[PDB]
Ligand binder design. Structure first.
Ligand SMILES: CCCCCCCCCCCCCCCC(=O)OC[C@H](COP(=O)(O)OCCN)OC(=O)CCCCCCCCCCCCCCC
Ligand SMILES: *[C@@H]1O[C@H](CO)[C@@H](O[C@@H]2O[C@H](CO)[C@@H](O[C@@H]3O[C@H](CO)[C@@H](O)[C@H](O)[C@@H]3O)[C@H](O)[C@H]2NC(C)=O)[C@H](O)[C@H]1NC(C)=O
Ligand SMILES: *[C@@H]1O[C@H](CO)[C@@H](O[C@@H]2O[C@H](CO)[C@@H](O[C@@H]3O[C@H](CO)[C@@H](O)[C@H](O)[C@@H]3O)[C@H](O)[C@H]2NC(C)=O)[C@H](O)[C@H]1NC(C)=O
Ligand SMILES: *[C@@H]1O[C@H](CO)[C@@H](O[C@@H]2O[C@H](CO)[C@@H](O[C@@H]3O[C@H](CO)[C@@H](O)[C@H](O)[C@@H]3O)[C@H](O)[C@H]2NC(C)=O)[C@H](O)[C@H]1NC(C)=O
Ligand SMILES: *[C@@H]1O[C@H](CO)[C@@H](O[C@@H]2O[C@H](CO)[C@@H](O[C@@H]3O[C@H](CO)[C@@H](O)[C@H](O)[C@@H]3O)[C@H](O)[C@H]2NC(C)=O)[C@H](O)[C@H]1NC(C)=O
Ligand SMILES: CCCCCCCCOCCOCCOCCOCCO
Ligand SMILES: CCCCCCCCOCCOCCOCCOCCO
Ligand SMILES: CCCCCCCCOCCOCCOCCOCCO
Ligand SMILES: CCCCCCCCOCCOCCOCCOCCO
Ligand SMILES: CCCCCCCCOCCOCCOCCOCCO
Ligand SMILES: CCCCCCCCOCCOCCOCCOCCO
Ligand SMILES: CCCCCCCCOCCOCCOCCOCCO
Ligand SMILES: CCCCCCCCOCCOCCOCCOCCO
Ligand SMILES: CCCCCCCCOCCOCCOCCOCCO
Ligand SMILES: CCCCCCCCOCCOCCOCCOCCO
Ligand SMILES: *C/C=C(C)/C=C\C=C(C)\C=C\C1=C(C)CCCC1(C)C
Ligand SMILES: *C/C=C(C)/C=C\C=C(C)\C=C\C1=C(C)CCCC1(C)C
Ligand SMILES: CCCCCCCCCCCC[N+](C)(C)[O-]
Ligand SMILES: CCCCCCCCCCCC[N+](C)(C)[O-]
Ligand SMILES: [Zn+2]
Ligand SMILES: [Zn+2]
Lengths: 328, 328
């Protein structure tokens, strides 16, 4: 056996030497050097200390400024909340788990770590869908003469939570399950075993198709309609050069947010897909550790892209932080 | 301009030196060394000389042996025909084009090269869908007391031609268009320009989503049902170890055919997707030439996998070739 399966775990280390132990019962220092567990710990700590303030700040500044009530403003406020859930709901546990070298909080801890990570990533993905659609509707006016205003913003936000929970929750109640990965200090969906009792196989498929592929198809479609229009379906829809310069700022930003998401998650995606199609194959704890922990930067990069690419949000922020002036 | 757009072409070479010419009017030797055009020519020649006999042989041996009437037998005969269409309908033109260093047959030649390549590739893709579904139905028998027999085989084949033509033909009559790629000696879908008059943008999206992604989703789903069953949904189906050993031969083969397709086409897919999302960017003729011509091995690898992994087909072949003794 290249790995060591347990009732509820899969250590990617051979147990021919009898050293393997459950990620829920004892430290995993036999997996790698303890200084490496310290690095993860240190890493999560930074994510928590960076993520807590930038997201809260985003949330705070938005609520405080009434003029910030556009779909974008709404979507980023949403991510700010999702990130705070990742930070406090999951990172605190992954940090603590990394310090002890295992899930001292048992499966319940692993569920927290896996749930919120999955929730945060998915909220970010589906949020991208809502934004692409909003850019589609606002830059090409297809449908009719409807207003993707504040009302749809709310509906847009609720939507992201519905989809994301549709992906993150099932494994909490029987369909697939959260399980330790890599150095065993973070938890992800079970791509490691078939474990037919929780119908693992069908969930992984469901996840990659409905919670990865479909969303990308939708965004790709929207991207299609925007390239086309910025080319010929816009010169006839009379787009004042003054509006386009501010509607191009926003369109550029969504594209960047979409690229950042792919940069952040594709690595994890690939290793997961691989493991899933090579279960039992010979791979170490470092194989998934790097992509997994790297993906956790998803709790931080969005507010940052936001602050750096949306002048209005930036100025409001400086205003909030300087009390009065460098408003809404 | 990093490239040179023309009414119906896109040479990936700057025309600041005025050397660029239309791939329909003159040789493209300024793009690369003439010995490289000789390599392509030599290459196509081998594909033709290999593809003609292995496909025909496959087709011939199948028709000759009546016992060869299962879905697999049917699907591979289908590919054999698809490949002969690629060889004769397209490669002869790409060969000749490589020899002259340009499309002396003008756009009509380019359509031939692009159509049959696209047709052959897609027929292979959708054929994979039909096989995966057939493996699904036959190895897990989900639907009721149903029979995926000869009748469905025919319907399966017709199906692959319908989808493949749905992808290859539209660009012949106004939706997108076949255009020279790389060193300008092979033609592909227009990922190079927006050319709104033929609605390029929307076709590329349609192609990647309906003629790449969806098919992969379907196969992935089937692969899901097989891993699950070969695991805990088949030990209750009392699959006698005698049949499984022959039904595992076939299942293994389809999986290999699926992997070979990804090995063969993903490279092309990626460069196409890239070019499409980086139109006008600085890339040379070699950027697409290698993946494109590599993909053309799609006219040859399937019959070979077939001969090498299906003992029954292999034995019939030896029989056909040795006359009588080495049957159906
Ligand atoms: C973690 C922090 C990452 C913050 C990076 C965000 C800054 C981007 C500024 C926009 C650049 C103009 C074309 C260039 C695209 C650049 C992509 C940058 C995306 C950042 C990756 C974050 C993932 C980690
Ligand atoms: C655990 O990981 C190991 C790799 O570290 C996997 O072993 C590989 O298993 C395959 C399948 O049996 C071997 O292939 C066979 O090789 C022989 C050559 O003697 C050949 O005659 C057979 O037809 C077949 O191709 C392979 O050699 C072996 N190692 C390699 C090269 O990767 C193993 O499958 C994994 N699973 C477990 C827990 O066993
Ligand atoms: C990896 O293999 C090792 C051994 O090679 C496993 O060690 C296990 O260690 C426990 C001690 O906590 C053993 O339990 C003992 O069992 C005996 C009865 O056999 C009982 O009398 C003692 O009181 C004690 O409970 C356990 O037997 C032993 N297992 C093996 C393989 O011998 C280890 O569990 C393996 N890793 C895992 C969990 O996959
Ligand atoms: C043709 O290919 C060239 C690259 O070979 C592309 O040019 C690049 O265009 C980007 C902008 O789209 C340039 O970035 C800009 O750089 C300046 C620094 O002076 C910075 O202030 C701007 O904010 C921006 O980042 C990049 O420098 C440039 N590369 C070079 C060296 O030319 C070009 O886009 C392609 N298509 C065209 C327009 O022909
Ligand atoms: C790349 O640039 C070259 C030149 O830098 C393009 O070819 C040149 O095209 C011009 C304009 O079509 C030709 O000029 C002709 O002049 C006569 C004057 O009697 C006029 O009646 C024609 O209407 C035309 O303007 C010029 O002959 C030709 N230069 C040559 C001989 O190579 C070339 O078309 C560009 N690449 C492409 C095809 O985009
Ligand atoms: C809303 C997230 C709550 C996640 C923690 C609860 C799950 C802990 O229960 C452990 C049972 O293990 C089954 C998996
Ligand atoms: C168990 C249901 C979840 C499966 C969703 C994946 C997408 C399936 O579509 C493929 C069609 O078969
Ligand atoms: C290069 C493809 C090798 C074929 C392996 C079958 C899995 C299909 O690959 C998924 C497509 O992603 C391309 C990345 O290629 C890396 C190969 O690793 C296989 C991923 O599990
Ligand atoms: C698969 C390779 C992982 C891709 C991520 O590489 C980025 C490097 O950043 C390291 C940060 O990860 C923390 C551990
Ligand atoms: C962790 C991210 C911290 C980013 C700090 C951004 C603070 C504002 O940046 C100032 C840069 O000013 C450039 C444009 O601002 C317009 C004001 O004039
Ligand atoms: C069975 C399909 C054969 C395809 C031949 C196409 C030749 C027609 O091209 C001539 C002009 O068309 C260029 C427009 O694209
Ligand atoms: C004009 C036809 C293009 C449709 C291809 C994409 C279909 C799936 O995308 C979902 C629509 O949003
Ligand atoms: C995936 C990035 C693009 C690299 C192209 C992959 C080519 C595969 O290498 C095999 C070499 O055969 C190609 C020969 O055909 C050219 C003539
Ligand atoms: C060593 C390769 C690192 C470069 C990876 C760039 C990823 C950018 O994300 C774009 C998404 O594209 C999908 C797959 O990415 C592969 C290359 O990206 C080029 C886009 O065609
Ligand atoms: C270009 C295709 C070359 C394929 C040659 C295959 C010819 C048959 O190979 C003979 C090898 O025999 C091993 C298994 O055959 C069963 C007969 O016993
Ligand atoms: C550090 C903990 C992690 C990364 C735990 C779990 C993550 C997932 C189950 C992620 C799933 C996916 C998302 C968020 C977006 C891309 C596709 C995906 C299905 C791999
Ligand atoms: C040598 C000539 C070639 C490769 C010409 C054109 C090929 C296409 C338009 C291929 C399309 C695709 C296929 C066959 C399967 C994978 C996805 C795809 C859409 C890129
Ligand atoms: C940011 C790009 C990194 C790769 C992202 C896409 C990976 C999908 C294919 C899996 C290949 C990964 N690997 C090493 C696990 O084989
Ligand atoms: C719908 C998108 C499908 C894209 C598949 C991409 C496969 C990657 C193949 C290599 C592409 C990398 N690049 C940038 C050099 O072209
Ligand atoms: Zn509204
Ligand atoms: Zn039938």
């Amino acid at each position: 056996m290249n790995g060591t399966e347990g009732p509820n775990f899969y250590v990617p280390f051979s147990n021919k030497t009898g050293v393997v132990r459950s990620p829920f019962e004892a430290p995993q220092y036999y997996l790698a050097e303890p200084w490496q567990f310290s690095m993860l710990a240190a890493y999560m700590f930074l994510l928590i200390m960076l993520g807590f303030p930038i997201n809260f700040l985003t949330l705070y500044v938005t609520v405080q400024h009434k003029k910030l009530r556009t779909p974008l403003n709404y979507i980023l406020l949403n991510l700010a909340v999702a990130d705070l859930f990742m930070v406090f709901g999951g990172f605190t546990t992954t940090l603590y788990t990394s310090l002890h070298g295992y899930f001292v909080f048992g499966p319940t801890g692993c569920n927290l770590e896996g749930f919120f990570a999955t929730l945060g990533g998915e909220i970010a993905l589906w949020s991208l869908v809502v934004l692409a659609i909003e850019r589609y509707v606002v830059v090409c006016k297809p449908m009719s003469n409807f207003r993707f205003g504040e009302n749809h913003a709310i509906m847009g936000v609720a939507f992201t939570w519905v989809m994301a929970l549709a992906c993150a929750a099932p494994p909490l109640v029987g369909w697939s399950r959260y399980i330790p990965e890599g150095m065993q200090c973070s938890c992800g969906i079970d791509y490691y075993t078939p474990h037919e009792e929780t119908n693992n196989e069908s969930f992984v498929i469901y996840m990659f198709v409905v919670h990865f592929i479909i969303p990308l198809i939708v965004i790709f479609f929207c991207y299609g309609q925007l390239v086309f229009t910025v080319k010929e379906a816009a010169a006839q829809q009379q787009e004042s050069a003054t509006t386009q310069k501010a509607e191009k700022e926003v369109t550029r930003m969504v594209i960047i947010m979409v690229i950042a998401f792919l940069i952040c998650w594709l690595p994890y995606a690939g290793v997961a897909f691989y493991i899933f199609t090579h279960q039992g194959s010979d791979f170490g704890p470092i194989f998934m550790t790097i992509p997994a922990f790297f993906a956790k930067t998803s709790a931080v990069y969005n507010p940052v892209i936001y602050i750096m690419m949306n002048k209005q949000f930036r100025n409001c922020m400086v205003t909030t932080l300087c009390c009065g002036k460098n408003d809404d």
